[PDB]
Amino acid sequence: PQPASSGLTDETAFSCCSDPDPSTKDFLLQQTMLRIKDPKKSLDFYTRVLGLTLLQKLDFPAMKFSLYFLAYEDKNDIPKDKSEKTAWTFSRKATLELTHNWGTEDDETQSYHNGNSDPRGFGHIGIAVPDVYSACKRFEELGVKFVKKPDDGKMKGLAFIQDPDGYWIEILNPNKIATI
Amino acid sequence: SGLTDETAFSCCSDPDPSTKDFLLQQTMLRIKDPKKSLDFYTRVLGLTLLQKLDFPAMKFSLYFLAYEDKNDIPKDKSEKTAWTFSRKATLELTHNWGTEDDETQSYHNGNSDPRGFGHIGIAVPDVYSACKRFEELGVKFVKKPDDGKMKGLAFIQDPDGYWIEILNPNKIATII
Ligand SMILES: COC(=O)c1c(C)cc(Oc2cc(C)cc(O)c2O)cc1O
Ligand SMILES: COC(=O)c1c(C)cc(Oc2cc(C)cc(O)c2O)cc1O
């Protein structure tokens, strides 16, 4: 009888992995896109609370939306010229593309779905920090909403907070994950 | 109407010094079948599986993939873990055991109501050669690069239906 799923063994998982085709050698994971209801709240949260930098604001009037690219970069590295700024922004690794469909911030019946309740899909973005505890102590002092405090529940030492739209953000210390 | 630049810039605070070494480490997506997903992300897109973590008590596995050289991955478990979790731009694929055997199950990609997450995106040197190879490998498309007014920008889908943007940073300015 078909065994109940126990997931994959490490051997089977790596057995399904192919080495990269030479044609993909320069590919890079550039962005994760999330739709946001109110850029005023989101920009304040990602820059003031999390410390990211707004790289570029792109407006598409014909389509009634704007894109806000945030990333952990030094503001002084951002080229000034719009064309120069654009090519740099899109070649940075690990950016967050926040999509603002005009008008949602004034529509009291509108809200986006964070992927963690029916129907599920996307789960969270995650930020590596040197100390989850001191980072979360500061988030508490700043009124950040928590999904999981570091010492609460499962996986102690790991925390989850949420942004203005309710998207979950994992806060982790890379050097302590191994000891759960 | 949208925000004026002034309004948006005024909502941006300079980074607090305590956040100086923070990094955006991962994006997590739930996946139905790890065999299909791992084949897709490694053989088609060229990412490398850095590490796999299992949690039997909760019946799920985590797969961490990134654009890294496999020869750089530390051999010892604890060193490997610290390394994986300190890489920027990794993709965490969560496999809740059993979904691969449920014909009535599929994850929601965020692009149909209720919307939220939209896509991850890969920067490449030539969107057209990349997509020609994707097409030849049987990859499904949401938007081919030459379709629509936003030319030279494509969206493909992974085995679960999640959207993946394929863009050329040097050619983006022409469609903004
Ligand atoms: C009750 O469930 C959880 O608390 C939980 C779940 C279900 C999953 C989880 O996944 C991860 C575990 C670890 C160790 C690292 C990650 O980046 C993760 O996304 C972490 C968690 O704390
Ligand atoms: C007509 O609709 C679209 O095709 C489209 C829309 C509506 C938005 C869109 O957003 C982006 C535009 C650009 C220039 C870069 C990105 O990473 C984007 O996510 C890209 C698109 O191709």
Ligand SMILES: [Zn+2]
């Ligand atoms: Zn995008």
Ligand SMILES: [Zn+2]
């Ligand atoms: Zn995670």
